[PDB]
Design an enzyme around this catalytic site. Structure first.
Site, PDB file in Angstrom:
ATOM      1  N   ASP A 171       0.847  -1.196   0.000  1.00 27.15           N
ATOM      2  CA  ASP A 171       0.000   0.000   0.000  1.00 27.15           C
ATOM      3  C   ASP A 171       0.885   1.250   0.000  1.00 27.15           C
ATOM      4  O   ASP A 171       1.132   1.878   1.035  1.00 27.15           O
ATOM      5  CB  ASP A 171      -0.925   0.006   1.206  1.00 27.15           C
ATOM      6  CG  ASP A 171      -1.997   1.056   1.089  1.00 27.15           C
ATOM      7  OD1 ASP A 171      -2.032   1.741   0.025  1.00 27.15           O
ATOM      8  OD2 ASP A 171      -2.849   1.143   2.010  1.00 27.15           O
ATOM      9  N   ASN A 198      11.859  -6.020  -8.279  1.00 24.63           N
ATOM     10  CA  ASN A 198      11.150  -4.804  -8.638  1.00 24.63           C
ATOM     11  C   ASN A 198      12.109  -3.627  -8.755  1.00 24.63           C
ATOM     12  O   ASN A 198      13.128  -3.548  -8.051  1.00 24.63           O
ATOM     13  CB  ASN A 198      10.036  -4.467  -7.621  1.00 24.63           C
ATOM     14  CG  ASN A 198      10.571  -3.804  -6.357  1.00 24.63           C
ATOM     15  OD1 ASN A 198      10.760  -2.585  -6.308  1.00 24.63           O
ATOM     16  ND2 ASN A 198      10.818  -4.614  -5.321  1.00 24.63           N
ATOM     17  N   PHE A 225      10.086   4.409  -6.634  1.00 22.06           N
ATOM     18  CA  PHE A 225       9.376   5.345  -5.761  1.00 22.06           C
ATOM     19  C   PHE A 225       8.229   6.043  -6.494  1.00 22.06           C
ATOM     20  O   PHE A 225       8.165   7.271  -6.544  1.00 22.06           O
ATOM     21  CB  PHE A 225      10.315   6.401  -5.166  1.00 22.06           C
ATOM     22  CG  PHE A 225      11.091   5.927  -3.966  1.00 22.06           C
ATOM     23  CD1 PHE A 225      10.618   4.884  -3.172  1.00 22.06           C
ATOM     24  CD2 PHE A 225      12.227   6.603  -3.546  1.00 22.06           C
ATOM     25  CE1 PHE A 225      11.318   4.447  -2.048  1.00 22.06           C
ATOM     26  CE2 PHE A 225      12.915   6.191  -2.392  1.00 22.06           C
ATOM     27  CZ  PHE A 225      12.459   5.104  -1.647  1.00 22.06           C
ATOM     28  N   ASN A 228      13.703   5.530   5.120  1.00 21.24           N
ATOM     29  CA  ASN A 228      14.125   4.470   4.232  1.00 21.24           C
ATOM     30  C   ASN A 228      15.348   4.968   3.480  1.00 21.24           C
ATOM     31  O   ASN A 228      15.226   5.738   2.516  1.00 21.24           O
ATOM     32  CB  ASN A 228      12.980   4.111   3.303  1.00 21.24           C
ATOM     33  CG  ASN A 228      13.353   3.041   2.378  1.00 21.24           C
ATOM     34  OD1 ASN A 228      14.390   2.424   2.563  1.00 21.24           O
ATOM     35  ND2 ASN A 228      12.562   2.843   1.327  1.00 21.24           N
ATOM     36  N   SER A 246      16.662   1.889  -0.364  1.00 16.80           N
ATOM     37  CA  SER A 246      16.025   1.484  -1.608  1.00 16.80           C
ATOM     38  C   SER A 246      17.062   1.341  -2.714  1.00 16.80           C
ATOM     39  O   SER A 246      17.815   2.290  -2.981  1.00 16.80           O
ATOM     40  CB  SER A 246      14.961   2.476  -2.038  1.00 16.80           C
ATOM     41  OG  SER A 246      14.488   2.117  -3.328  1.00 16.80           O
ATOM     42  N   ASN A 282      16.639   1.437  -5.825  1.00 19.11           N
ATOM     43  CA  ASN A 282      16.093   1.931  -7.084  1.00 19.11           C
ATOM     44  C   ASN A 282      16.060   3.458  -7.161  1.00 19.11           C
ATOM     45  O   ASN A 282      15.312   4.025  -7.965  1.00 19.11           O
ATOM     46  CB  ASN A 282      14.698   1.327  -7.300  1.00 19.11           C
ATOM     47  CG  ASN A 282      14.714  -0.211  -7.236  1.00 19.11           C
ATOM     48  OD1 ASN A 282      15.576  -0.857  -7.842  1.00 19.11           O
ATOM     49  ND2 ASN A 282      13.808  -0.791  -6.456  1.00 19.11           N
ATOM     50  N   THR A 283      16.872   4.137  -6.360  1.00 18.04           N
ATOM     51  CA  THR A 283      17.035   5.580  -6.471  1.00 18.04           C
ATOM     52  C   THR A 283      18.526   5.875  -6.404  1.00 18.04           C
ATOM     53  O   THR A 283      19.232   5.337  -5.543  1.00 18.04           O
ATOM     54  CB  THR A 283      16.240   6.329  -5.374  1.00 18.04           C
ATOM     55  OG1 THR A 283      14.863   6.443  -5.776  1.00 18.04           O
ATOM     56  CG2 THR A 283      16.802   7.734  -5.110  1.00 18.04           C
ATOM     57  N   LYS A 286      15.417   1.993   8.079  1.00 15.52           N
ATOM     58  CA  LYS A 286      15.284   0.765   7.309  1.00 15.52           C
ATOM     59  C   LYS A 286      16.529   0.618   6.450  1.00 15.52           C
ATOM     60  O   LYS A 286      16.871   1.522   5.677  1.00 15.52           O
ATOM     61  CB  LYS A 286      14.016   0.767   6.447  1.00 15.52           C
ATOM     62  CG  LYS A 286      13.837  -0.496   5.628  1.00 15.52           C
ATOM     63  CD  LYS A 286      12.445  -0.584   5.050  1.00 15.52           C
ATOM     64  CE  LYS A 286      12.234  -1.934   4.393  1.00 15.52           C
ATOM     65  NZ  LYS A 286      10.838  -2.160   3.948  1.00 15.52           N
ATOM     66  N   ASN A 345      15.506  -4.185   3.694  1.00 13.83           N
ATOM     67  CA  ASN A 345      14.955  -3.949   2.375  1.00 13.83           C
ATOM     68  C   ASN A 345      15.442  -5.050   1.399  1.00 13.83           C
ATOM     69  O   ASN A 345      16.298  -5.887   1.720  1.00 13.83           O
ATOM     70  CB  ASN A 345      15.503  -2.633   1.864  1.00 13.83           C
ATOM     71  CG  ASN A 345      14.532  -1.886   1.055  1.00 13.83           C
ATOM     72  OD1 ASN A 345      13.885  -2.439   0.157  1.00 13.83           O
ATOM     73  ND2 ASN A 345      14.429  -0.597   1.332  1.00 13.83           N
ATOM     74  N   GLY A 365      11.850 -12.099  -1.174  1.00 18.09           N
ATOM     75  CA  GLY A 365      11.308 -13.426  -1.026  1.00 18.09           C
ATOM     76  C   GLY A 365      12.319 -14.383  -0.452  1.00 18.09           C
ATOM     77  O   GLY A 365      13.217 -13.977   0.305  1.00 18.09           O
ATOM     78  N   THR A 389       6.268 -10.493  -0.026  1.00 15.75           N
ATOM     79  CA  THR A 389       6.308 -11.405  -1.162  1.00 15.75           C
ATOM     80  C   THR A 389       5.405 -12.619  -0.947  1.00 15.75           C
ATOM     81  O   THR A 389       4.706 -13.046  -1.876  1.00 15.75           O
ATOM     82  CB  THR A 389       7.732 -11.847  -1.432  1.00 15.75           C
ATOM     83  OG1 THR A 389       8.461 -10.751  -1.993  1.00 15.75           O
ATOM     84  CG2 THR A 389       7.732 -13.001  -2.415  1.00 15.75           C
TER      85      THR A 389
HETATM   86  C1  LIG Z   1       7.002  -4.671  -5.304  1.00  8.47           C
HETATM   87  C2  LIG Z   1       7.722  -4.205  -4.080  1.00  8.47           C
HETATM   88  C3  LIG Z   1       7.676  -2.872  -3.694  1.00  8.47           C
HETATM   89  C4  LIG Z   1       8.354  -2.453  -2.552  1.00  8.47           C
HETATM   90  N1  LIG Z   1       8.329  -1.129  -2.160  1.00  8.47           N
HETATM   91  C5  LIG Z   1       8.988  -0.702  -1.014  1.00  8.47           C
HETATM   92  C6  LIG Z   1       8.943   0.639  -0.601  1.00  8.47           C
HETATM   93  O1  LIG Z   1       8.285   1.478  -1.239  1.00  8.47           O
HETATM   94  N2  LIG Z   1       9.626   1.022   0.539  1.00  8.47           N
HETATM   95  C7  LIG Z   1      10.322   0.094   1.291  1.00  8.47           C
HETATM   96  O2  LIG Z   1      10.933   0.424   2.323  1.00  8.47           O
HETATM   97  N3  LIG Z   1      10.361  -1.217   0.878  1.00  8.47           N
HETATM   98  C8  LIG Z   1       9.700  -1.619  -0.259  1.00  8.47           C
HETATM   99  N4  LIG Z   1       9.742  -2.948  -0.640  1.00  8.47           N
HETATM  100  C9  LIG Z   1      10.549  -3.904   0.178  1.00  8.47           C
HETATM  101  C10 LIG Z   1       9.678  -4.590   1.201  1.00  8.47           C
HETATM  102  O3  LIG Z   1       9.131  -3.637   2.060  1.00  8.47           O
HETATM  103  C11 LIG Z   1      10.499  -5.532   2.078  1.00  8.47           C
HETATM  104  O4  LIG Z   1      11.493  -4.843   2.795  1.00  8.47           O
HETATM  105  C12 LIG Z   1      10.998  -6.815   1.381  1.00  8.47           C
HETATM  106  O5  LIG Z   1      10.552  -6.911   0.042  1.00  8.47           O
HETATM  107  C13 LIG Z   1      10.086  -7.739   2.099  1.00  8.47           C
HETATM  108  O6  LIG Z   1      10.595  -8.984   2.313  1.00  8.47           O
HETATM  109  P1  LIG Z   1       9.602 -10.012   1.584  1.00  8.47           P
HETATM  110  O7  LIG Z   1       8.946  -9.291   0.440  1.00  8.47           O
HETATM  111  O8  LIG Z   1      10.568 -11.087   1.051  1.00  8.47           O
HETATM  112  O9  LIG Z   1       8.519 -10.464   2.542  1.00  8.47           O
HETATM  113  C14 LIG Z   1       9.072  -3.367  -1.789  1.00  8.47           C
HETATM  114  C15 LIG Z   1       9.112  -4.693  -2.185  1.00  8.47           C
HETATM  115  C16 LIG Z   1       8.439  -5.114  -3.317  1.00  8.47           C
HETATM  116  C17 LIG Z   1       8.505  -6.567  -3.698  1.00  8.47           C
HETATM  117  O1  LIG Z   2       9.990   1.930  -5.039  1.00  5.02           O
HETATM  118  C1  LIG Z   2      10.907   1.013  -5.263  1.00  5.02           C
HETATM  119  O2  LIG Z   2      11.322   0.720  -6.381  1.00  5.02           O
HETATM  120  C2  LIG Z   2      11.457   0.338  -4.069  1.00  5.02           C
HETATM  121  C3  LIG Z   2      11.716   0.986  -2.907  1.00  5.02           C
HETATM  122  C4  LIG Z   2      12.278   0.271  -1.815  1.00  5.02           C
HETATM  123  O3  LIG Z   2      12.563   0.757  -0.717  1.00  5.02           O
HETATM  124  N1  LIG Z   2      12.526  -1.074  -2.038  1.00  5.02           N
HETATM  125  C5  LIG Z   2      12.274  -1.755  -3.198  1.00  5.02           C
HETATM  126  O4  LIG Z   2      12.528  -2.952  -3.322  1.00  5.02           O
HETATM  127  N2  LIG Z   2      11.730  -1.013  -4.210  1.00  5.02           N
END
Ligand SMILES: Cc1cc2nc3c(=O)[nH]c(=O)nc-3n(C[C@H](O)[C@H](O)[C@H](O)COP(=O)(O)O)c2cc1C
Ligand SMILES: O=C(O)c1cc(=O)[nH]c(=O)[nH]1
Ligand SMILES: CC(F)(F)COc1cccc(-c2c(F)c(F)c(NC(=O)c3c(O)nn4ccccc34)c(F)c2F)c1
Length: 366
Positions: free
Chosen positions: A69, A115, A119, A182, A185, A187-188, A225, A254, A276, A327
């Site tokens: 979300d 992914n 952001f 955070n 990430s 991806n920035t 994080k 992350n 995952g 995941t």
């Molecule tokens: C599609 C996707 C989008 C994510 N977006 C964010 C994000 O916006 N901010 C963040 O701190 N982590 C983000 N994450 C990382 C997850 O919060 C998390 O730290 C990690 O993917 C979770 O472990 P798990 O997915 O293996 O359960 C994202 C992960 C995925 C797969």
């Molecule tokens: O928005 C993303 O691309 C993103 C942010 C983040 O903190 N972690 C991640 O896996 N993707």
């Protein structure tokens, strides 16, 4: 293992994934959830799953990680799913579009996802008004042990990272039970490298000072994080700054920009963060170092490849007071929340724990 559980895993989920690219499936998951189209959560949380941390009750330790979300659109449907806490975001100050599509990829043979959303965010303002519309409903939810966390990020174009994070603390700080800086990430450009010891110290000083300027009942806790890709130098330094500045906790960890040996998915060489099962133990080991480096004094939310009570319990015994997943929900569907909680409780009893709290950091005392 309920009928919903086996039905969603063996039939509903693989069919949706058969028709829908992951980004499309994510968008639908959010809609269904926002509308409350969800199976009955027939698990009733027990007293053993209660946790008091970060100046708050959590009625269970299983939360949905940030990234599902992103914009605050489905918070109530996620509590109804059965999570004990919800974390929204990442939210960036200004709205921004994120990376060109396709930007999400499944590795089904690995129970993994890659992914590079980059952001994509509706922005502080839109999310602020979203959360204001339910601010008092959430005050009640928090009282009942269902807290709300808001994850902050910065804009692609942004010149001063700390001013992005401070804006977020000011605008969404009053709406959150905890905020997450955070700095991890993949991806920035420049964001993971927001740990130059004195760099990270300066960023986090401005965040905590901004946070302390909020009125007492709108003062969240502040977490960092981190990535699972950190050198040993980086973790030592994070541990040091966190204790120097009084940071309230750590979210560990992350996604990874590494690619462990053995990945089988065709898409394994896509650019982005891997989540995952390939992340699970790399995640659990970072909880473990961070807990030791902070003498078990800094709460840790563990996250990485959790799909079962065993996975959640290994992270708690490795130091986590709370866990998140993401995941596992995209393979199992909503029933995965009840499944992890039911299994967590059973293992706590067989291993002789009185509850979750007795088991936090248990491995460091054996
Ligand atoms: C599609 C996707 C989008 C994510 N977006 C964010 C994000 O916006 N901010 C963040 O701190 N982590 C983000 N994450 C990382 C997850 O919060 C998390 O730290 C990690 O993917 C979770 O472990 P798990 O997915 O293996 O359960 C994202 C992960 C995925 C797969
Ligand atoms: O928005 C993303 O691309 C993103 C942010 C983040 O903190 N972690 C991640 O896996 N993707
Ligand atoms: C009445 C009913 F029977 F419809 C109740 O059904 C529901 C109810 C609630 C939620 C869902 C639901 C769903 F439809 C899905 F498509 C997904 N898939 C993904 O999110 C997904 C994916 O696949 N890859 N991927 C990669 C990155 C990020 C996300 C994803 C999902 F996670 C869901 F939780 C289904």
């Amino acid at each position: 293992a309920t009928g919903d559980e086996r039905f969603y895993a063996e039939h509903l989920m693989p069919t949706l994934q058969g028709l829908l690219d992951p980004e499309s499936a994510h968008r639908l998951a959010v809609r269904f959830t926002s509308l409350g189209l969800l199976p009955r959560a027939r698990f009733q949380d027990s007293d053993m799953l209660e946790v008091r941390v970060l100046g708050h009750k959590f009625r269970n330790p299983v939360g949905i990680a940030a990234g599902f979300d992103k914009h605050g659109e489905a918070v109530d449907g996620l509590y109804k799913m059965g999570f004990g806490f919800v974390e929204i975001g990442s939210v960036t100050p200004k709205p921004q579009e994120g990376n060109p599509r396709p930007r999400v990829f499944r590795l089904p043979e690995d129970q993994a996802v890659i992914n590079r959303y980059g952001f994509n965010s509706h922005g502080l303002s839109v999310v602020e008004h979203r959360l204001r519309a339910r601010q008092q409903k959430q005050a009640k939810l928090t009282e009942d042990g269902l807290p709300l966390g808001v994850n902050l990020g910065k804009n692609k174009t942004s010149v001063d990272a700390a001013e992005d994070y401070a804006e977020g603390v000011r605008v969404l700080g009053p709406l959150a039970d905890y905020l997450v800086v955070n700095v991890s990430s993949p991806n920035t450009a420049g964001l993971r490298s927001l740990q130059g010891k004195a760099e990270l110290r300066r960023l986090l000083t401005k965040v905590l000072q901004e946070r302390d300027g909020l009125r007492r009942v709108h003062r969240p806790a502040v977490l960092v994080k981190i990535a699972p890709d950190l050198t040993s130098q980086d973790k030592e330094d994070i541990a040091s700054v966190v204790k120097e500045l009084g940071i309230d906790g750590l979210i560990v960890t992350n996604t990874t920009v590494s690619r462990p040996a053995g990945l089988q998915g065709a898409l394994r060489s896509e650019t982005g963060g891997l989540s995952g099962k390939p992340l699970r133990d790399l995640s659990t080991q970072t909880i473990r170092e961070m807990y030791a480096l902070t003498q078990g004094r800094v709460p840790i939310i563990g996250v990485g490849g959790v799909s079962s009570g065993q996975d959640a319990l290994e992270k708690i015994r490795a130091g986590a007071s709370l866990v998140q997943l993401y995941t596992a929900l995209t393979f199992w569907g909503p029933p995965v929340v009840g499944k992890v909680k039911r299994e967590l409780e059973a293992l706590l009893k067989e291993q002789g724990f009185g509850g979750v709290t007795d088991a936090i950091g248990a491995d460091h005392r054996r």
